[PDB]
Amino acid sequence: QVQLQQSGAELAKPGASVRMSCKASGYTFTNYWMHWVKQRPGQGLEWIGYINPTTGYTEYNQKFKDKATLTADKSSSTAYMQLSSLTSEDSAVYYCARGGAGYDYDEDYAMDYWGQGTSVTVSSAKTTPPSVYPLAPGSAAQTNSMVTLGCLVKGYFPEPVTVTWNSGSLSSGVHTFPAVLQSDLYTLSSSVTVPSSPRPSETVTCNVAHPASSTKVDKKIV
Amino acid sequence: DIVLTQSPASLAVSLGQRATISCRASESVEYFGTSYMNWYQQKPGQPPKLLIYLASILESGIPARFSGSGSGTDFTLNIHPVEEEDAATYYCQQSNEDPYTFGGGTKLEIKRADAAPTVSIFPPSSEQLTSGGASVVCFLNNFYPKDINVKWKIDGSERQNGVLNSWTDQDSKDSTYSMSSTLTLTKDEYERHNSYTCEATHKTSTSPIVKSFNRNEC
Amino acid sequence: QDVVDLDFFTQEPLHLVSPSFLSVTIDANLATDPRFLILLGSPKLRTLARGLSPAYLRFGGTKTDFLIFDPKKE
Amino acid sequence: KFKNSTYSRSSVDVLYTFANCSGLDLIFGLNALLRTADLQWNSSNAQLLLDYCSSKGYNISWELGNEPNSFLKKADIFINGSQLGEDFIQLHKLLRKSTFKNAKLYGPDVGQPRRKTAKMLKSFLKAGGEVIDSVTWHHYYLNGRTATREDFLNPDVLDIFISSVQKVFQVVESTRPGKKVWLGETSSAYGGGAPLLSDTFAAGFMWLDKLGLSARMGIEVVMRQVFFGAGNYHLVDENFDPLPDYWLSLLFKKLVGTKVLMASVQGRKLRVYLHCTNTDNPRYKEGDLTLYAINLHNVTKYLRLPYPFSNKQVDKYLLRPLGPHGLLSKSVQLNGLTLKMVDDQTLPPLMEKPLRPGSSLGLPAFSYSFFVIRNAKVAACI
Ligand SMILES: *[C@@H]1O[C@H](CO[C@@H]2O[C@@H](C)[C@@H](O)[C@@H](O)[C@@H]2O)[C@@H](O)[C@H](O)[C@H]1NC(C)=O
Ligand SMILES: *[C@@H]1O[C@H](CO)[C@@H](O)[C@H](O)[C@H]1NC(C)=O
Ligand SMILES: *[C@@H]1O[C@H](CO)[C@@H](O)[C@H](O)[C@H]1NC(C)=O
Ligand SMILES: *[C@@H]1O[C@H](CO)[C@@H](O)[C@H](O)[C@H]1NC(C)=O
Questions:
Q1: Could you say which of 3.40.50.2000, 3.20.20.80, 1.10.10.10, 3.20.20.380 is the CATH number of the domain covering D9-260?
Q2: Per UniProt, where does heparan sulfate group bind (chain C)?
């Protein structure tokens, strides 16, 4: 369907630069204005600039003008944004929107469909794979009437991590907790409620994924 | 650079009742006779999505209950009734000129009935121990309101240094809050003790909810 | 097809444009060229310019608002 | 980016003499970013210039500021339309107290009508509209950096000019109805032009269409950016050699008269304009018509004139690029004859091709032509 897919999360170092992507699909790419919006980590939301892919009309935010370079690419229905002289101020989530039927400025009034956002992280602190630890009693008890088990992910950099419980199974009992920073590393944990009957005769294995280090880890709860 | 100021910054509203968010602006958001205001909805970990454009026009997929009014500089979002999903940060954005500005953001709590925390405590993993580090996890789930206090106890002595906490955003399904308290020790602090207690002080209980384990446990 | 019929309206003039309708500019920034005098002094250029008479010549551009007249400069 | 620069009496004499000697009427843009404490305009540097020009007996018209909608971006200073209007009033007072009290004043030289620009213009005209002789605005179709060949040939691109013009009139008719409206700076692509496009035969579709539309919609004067310069949207290149748009402009001047009429196809990619013929051309007489047409189709099209002009003697003036570079050529042919200045002081004659009376008018793929209808004896033209 109408759909913008942005690049993978980038863990670039200070003073350096990076190119974010935002492929569009489900509509004629060139007939719509693409805006770019910045979200400081849970601190609010702000517009950066829009660009028409046929004409070439760019208008930036005074604040972001010397930092941001919006470029289109007619050939491949793709859009880009370059970010230079990166500081911790630039560590944030960047969304790519849409919504302007036409080619002229006055034809954009609102942003219709949005991207998933790209987390950009700026510290030269190194990249470390997580350690996944299974959480149950020493041996889980069928006594536990709703069996609630956990998965602790400790000592990783950088964000993010993908946590699931039974290969995407076990939806709707999942409490995956916000990672809190430990000076140089991140750490999070999840837990899931299930009946008495599954634990004893059925395995429970939470599926962890850390793309930055390229690690997929399955951990059986015993 | 019309200044967008969003009157309530958070509001708890009761499921079924009407929620009324204000947005104000510097200057005026009206060219010819059309008022260029835009309302979005950032769900917790999700991108905003357009609700209402040009102050009073409901985008597609958007339920008939969200309703924009106002003009000039005074704009008002109105949800009626309030449902569980509606919990989010709501943003009002001006389209009236370049550059576009964005309001601060008004967050919506749902006033669910009080609920008691489903506390749980887990011992350090076999593997973690062998590595030289020990971490005791305590999950307090599905409570409301958001306010809560975890007091870690080690053989009856309160541990205040070495704990890491984390609250989830308001659940969109049951409208509850969850939390995860983790205490971390080196080896030779863990082996030193037997009982580890996770105590949780909530409005629901007269007196704290207590969950515990002894190191002598198989 | 390749067959095209036209309809004309010739009953009254719809607008009356200036004889100088088509006019031209010189970018203000050209005045920062050290050779400004040599360039605009070109007989070749003046022949071409004359071709476009009658017209306005607008001297302007972004540099308009960063140009300062100094009556002591030569 | 830009820092302040000084200019001299000498520079002023160079510019003036170039204009005077070429039979051109000079419009000089004054610096609007010279400001007092109260953010009013410091008229003083202007006063010095005016006195100098007055003392030389120079016949000059005036503007104040360029793209004021951009002052914030360019100089970190914001001047609202109101104040800019007040500043123009102050310039008007100075002009009326000068040796040339009947000098003309134009402004505000705003960019194309986005909402921000259209609010600045409206507020300017309310405040200062009484003292300007014409309203000036600027238009470009594209960004020079990104423009493509297909953009220069796309009727959907050409057509956006229309709504820009309409929007300007909507502002002016709400504030100063009947004030004349001028394109004060205009071309294909902003930021110095699009290379190998703004300087070629292909640039002509945009340029001729603009002229046609402008005249048809009520614009009185159109000022091409630039005549000569660093930008690729120049009519004359760095070696003082004319480019296809120059030749197109020269032909337009020779043939096209001031009274604007209307032509229309019965069917977007075939564009058609009609004026009285320039009667100052000794070859033609009162009552003759000049049609001009643009073919953006990928095949030749054949035009048939309506009664009573079906069987008139017609002179064709068909422009096509000299190969091999097709629409990206910097050389052009008129009726198969390459156009080149005879020498440094001498333009070539522009030679018609008389057609058979009663023949259809051929317009090849991706070309443009003028056609003079002789003995049209149209009453409106006399
Ligand atoms: C020529 O353009 C084609 C599109 O056709 C256009 O519409 C019809 C009605 C005719 O008027 C035709 O002249 C128009 O150009 C393209 O699909 C096609 O690929 C093109 N062919 C060539 C020779 O390039
Ligand atoms: C304008 O400039 C003049 C000369 O540079 C200066 O003396 C004057 O104080 C300025 N105007 C005001 C009122 O600031
Ligand atoms: C315009 O700007 C002046 C100062 O430059 C300020 O005093 C005035 O209030 C402004 N007017 C409006 C309403 O834009
Ligand atoms: C010169 O100025 C006077 C009035 O200021 C005007 O009447 C005359 O026509 C001007 N010359 C030109 C070439 O416009």
A1: 3.20.20.80
A2: 27-29, 62
